[PDB]
């Protein structure tokens, strides 16, 4: 073996890399946007007053006085901090009441509450899937699903976006691979992970065909409805209410309450058999502090407002349709999404060679729009970590408080600005 002197020389000559590499790229994400005051409709950004077309606040429950009053009462009763996990004196009565309300709202047996929107799905996925299992996940799943899948060392087989024939082909090949070795097929579990309303592309998954495929090839369905929880359906119950699928056919429904309910946290609802397991095997649940009672009361009052008045979904639908129909016709931009989608994307038709120049062009459009008092944002991704990187795009988000004239003026402003820049 090595002499001691050689060991000293080898230890002495080693020189490691810097902890973080230098960032010389003039990275636009380094320049954050500074919002003064609440991020509500008619906000102020970078010192300019603007109409808000960027924040995921579909029902406009962020500044509803009843929600604020409920949160204030909870603050005056409990305080701010929870001071423990859900297991160790951290469970309050508001937590149980909120779980009950969510379960009764989704017409489901049991629901579970997570204190962070990412952690809910990123810890639900690896709870049920272990090494050796097979997961068929859509290509354009959001980042949280990707990290959850990476957490569980199972096998991942991507399939083309909303291509059901492609999932059918993958499932047939898996059936052949089971035919070869029955012993392993007796132990291998099959999952299908899909999103109710995709964030990256703003399209909606074909649920009936998914249910038929599940009952034919025996694969359990996981549904993520981060965007469609409070916007789709007549009663706003998700995509299952929109398509008419019975809620039992879906094994697990996960959604974060940050977008529609306008409060921090996420939740997962389903039959008691599947839900009871996360309370012990969910890493985001066992080893983290519970949600503060303030936000729980805010969510409860949001649910009461949602259940009392169900016409807000109808007005949201009509506004989404109107803006989608108005934005069609731009000179050099294409609209990506379906009519019924609250948040969609505007992308370039003719793409220059590099991606960073496309980002700079989009930022030019965004700035010249914001100088006309319409606040828009651009979709942000991690280029190195994303499994399937979507093209750069400007995000357009529709909200109930925006009037009709504001939608018309936003469309005209965007059209004139883009025709000035691209040309």
């Amino acid at each position: 073996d090595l002499t001691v002197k050689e060991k000293e020389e080898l230890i002495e000559e080693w020189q490691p890399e810097p902890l973080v590499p230098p960032v010389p790229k003039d990275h636009p994400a380094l320049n954050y946007n500074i919002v003064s005051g609440p991020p509500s409709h008619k906000t102020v950004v970078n010192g300019k007053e603007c109409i808000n077309f960027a924040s995921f606040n579909f029902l406009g429950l962020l500044d509803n006085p009843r929600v604020k009053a409920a949160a204030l009462a909870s603050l005056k009763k409990y305080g701010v901090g929870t001071c423990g996990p859900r297991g160790f004196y951290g469970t309050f009565d508001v937590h149980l009441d909120l779980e009950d309300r969510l379960a009764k709202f989704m017409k489901t047996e049991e629901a579970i509450i997570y204190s962070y929107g990412f952690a809910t799905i990123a810890s639900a996925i690896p709870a049920y899937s272990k090494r050796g299992d097979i997961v068929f996940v859509d290509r354009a799943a959001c980042f949280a699903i990707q990290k959850g899948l990476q957490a569980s060392r199972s096998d991942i087989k991507l399939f083309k976006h909303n291509d059901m024939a492609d999932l059918e082909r993958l499932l047939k090949e898996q059936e052949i691979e089971d035919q070869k070795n029955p012993r392993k097929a007796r132990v291998t579990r099959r999952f299908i992970v899909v999103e109710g309303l995709y964030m990256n592309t703003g399209t909606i998954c074909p649920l009936p065909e998914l249910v038929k495929l599940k009952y034919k090839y025996k694969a359990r369905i996981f549904l993520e409805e981060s965007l469609s929880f409070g916007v789709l359906g007549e009663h706003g119950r998700g995509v299952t209410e929109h398509y008419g699928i019975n809620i039992d056919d879906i094994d697990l429904i996960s959604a974060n309450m940050e977008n529609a309910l306008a409060s921090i946290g996420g939740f997962c609802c389903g039959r008691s058999f599947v839900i009871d397991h996360q309370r012990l095997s969910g890493q985001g649940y066992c080893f983290s502090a519970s949600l503060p009672p303030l936000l729980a009361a805010a969510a409860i009052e949001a649910l009461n407002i949602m259940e009392e008045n169900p016409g807000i979904f109808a007005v949201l639908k009509e506004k989404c349709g109107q803006i989608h129909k108005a934005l069609q016709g731009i000179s050099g931009l294409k609209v990506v999404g379906e009519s019924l989608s609250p948040a969609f994307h505007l992308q370039l038709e003719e793409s220059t060679g590099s991606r960073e120049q496309d980002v700079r062009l989009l930022q030019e459009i965004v700035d010249q729009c914001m100088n006309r008092s319409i606040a828009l944002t651009q979709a942000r991704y991690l280029e190195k970590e994303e499994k399937c990187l979507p093209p750069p795009s400007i995000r357009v988000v529709v909200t109930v408080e925006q009037t009709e004239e504001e939608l018309e003026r936003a469309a005209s402003t965007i059209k004139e600005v883009a025709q000035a820049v691209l040309l």
């Binding site: 924040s55 990412f118 579990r189 012990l280 942000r380």
Partner: protein, 492 residues
């Protein structure tokens, strides 16, 4: 490695008879669990556990049965100790909703009674900032009225506010580092910022008893993971020498980076990390340090800056300074502090900054007010009496427990006090007897501890007066007399 104040800790060995009886109890429980499983298999006894909906019987079973064995037989029998609902502010005294079960802990029904006045040894609140009155609550109420509850978008797009900037600057001043950043949840902080730093081709030296979040963060990134013994500096030095000399496993190439994950205070064992020796080793072997100060940000130190103040070291030595606001400051959230370049890179490349919602406004205002109170800027002496009272409380409580004869782990300064039970049934017995005598405690088992050492955790606080500690100590003494828990051989 210079220790300017003496470093005392004690980890007494388990007596032989106690270990043997522990194994006997565990074996009996396992055998009766097997018998119960066999009885349930032939449908002799109907299973309370939920079953598959009928037309999904052909699918491969969702759970392997053997995986839930421990949950089905060991855990379910004493489930009433955990998940106790509370209906008041988790101060020194908490109000618990009383519940009962008729099917041996499978289902729980809440009776009308509320158990009022329970002494609260479970909730952290080290500095006693968990109250429903005061200046912190008024400031939080004002910001709640002005800003609303929650924000609706990620930090990079529109979710960055002026409150977050004020909080980041204030934390930067508080710790002493050049820059800092704040995140929604501490678990998220670890599991979303470890992958950004180290990638495939780097080595992560992790403590044996590290929190689950740090392990998850290490696994998410592709870095190789090796584990050293808990506070064994010789083991750490051996690992560092071997790693530098031999190199990457398959192809013996030099490592890109070597990162050391340590914690300020280990919650279960209650021991403080040997920081001066760790820093000396880091300097000698050119590694990087990631210090998780979740349990020691407020409790430890003459002015509560953290463990680095406790040892009188220099904060610029630690490369990454993580921390959590939940334990001490009384609000949820996490933070990472360090040099300016590191924080710029994190703001650009962190998963949480890109794909996760910002921190709530009332919460950040509560954090700002609590931090301003600790830093002596409020104008009152209330940020000093908290630390002094916490130190005296920990001293008195630990000394009195040691005089009576229990086995107590950890450093003599650590506020978290683990007491040893060592037997499976004694866990539930201790929990039920303690709550019966009007003190609430927390006990732990396999998902957090090894087999022999099953312990009960006390989290001291500045809110506890002397009379509360006196009554609690007398009741612990009587229970220890009752359950025969005084195992210590030296002093009794």
């Amino acid at each position: 490695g210079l220790y300017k104040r003496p470093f005392n800790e004690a980890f007494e060995e388990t007596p032989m008879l106690v270990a043997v009886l522990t194994y006997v109890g565990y074996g009996v429980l396992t055998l009766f669990g097997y018998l119960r499983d066999f009885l349930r298999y032939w449908r002799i006894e109907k299973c309370h556990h939920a079953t598959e909906r009928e037309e999904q019987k052909d699918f491969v079973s969702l759970y392997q049965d053997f995986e839930n064995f421990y949950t089905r037989n060991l855990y379910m029998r004493i489930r009433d100790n955990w998940n106790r609902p509370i209906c008041s502010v988790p101060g020194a005294r908490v109000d618990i909703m009383e519940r009962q079960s008729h099917d041996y802990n499978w289902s729980f029904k809440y009776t009308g009674n509320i158990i009022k006045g329970v002494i609260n040894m479970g909730s952290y609140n080290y500095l006693g900032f968990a109250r429903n009155t005061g200046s912190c609550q008024e400031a939080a109420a004002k910001v709640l009225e002005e800003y609303g509850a929650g924000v609706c978008s990620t930090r990079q797009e529109i979710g960055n506010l002026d409150k977050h900037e004020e909080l980041e600057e204030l934390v930067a001043r508080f710790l002493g580092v050049e820059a800092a950043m704040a995140y929604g949840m501490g678990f998220a902080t670890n599991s979303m910022n470890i992958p950004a730093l180290v990638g495939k081709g780097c080595l992560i030296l992790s403590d044996e008893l590290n929190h689950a979040s740090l392990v998850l963060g290490a696994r998410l990134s592709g870095a190789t993971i090796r584990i050293f013994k808990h506070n064994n500096m010789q083991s750490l030095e051996k690992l560092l020498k071997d790693a530098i000399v031999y190199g990457q496993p398959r192809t013996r190439r030099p490592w890109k980076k070597i990162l050391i994950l340590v914690e300020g205070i280990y919650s279960m064992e209650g021991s403080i990390v040997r920081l001066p020796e760790v820093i000396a080793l880091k300097k000698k072997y050119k590694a990087y340090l990631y210090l998780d100060e979740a349990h020691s940000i407020g409790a430890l130190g003459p002015t509560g800056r953290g463990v680095v103040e406790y040892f009188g070291l220099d904060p610029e030595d630690v490369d990454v300074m993580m921390g959590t606001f939940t334990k001490s400051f009384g609000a949820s959230g996490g933070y990472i502090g360090g040099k300016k370049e590191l924080i710029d890179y994190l703001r650009t490349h962190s998963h949480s900054a890109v794909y996760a919602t910002s921190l709530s406004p009332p919460v950040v205002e509560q954090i700002i007010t609590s931090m301003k109170c600790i830093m002596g800027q409020d104008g009152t002496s209330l940020g000093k009496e908290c630390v002094q009272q916490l130190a005296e409380n920990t001293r008195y409580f630990r000394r009195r427990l040691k005089e009576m004869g229990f086995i107590i782990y950890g450093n003599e300064d650590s506020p978290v006090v683990p007491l040893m039970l060592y037997m499976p049934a004694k866990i539930g017995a201790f929990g039920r007897e303690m709550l019966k005598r009007n003190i609430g405690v927390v006990v732990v088992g396999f998902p957090a501890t090894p087999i022999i050492e099953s312990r009960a955790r006390f989290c001291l606080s500045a809110a506890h007066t002397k009379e509360i500690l006196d009554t609690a100590l007398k009741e612990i003494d009587e229970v220890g007399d009752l359950l025969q828990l005084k195992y210590s051989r030296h002093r009794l």
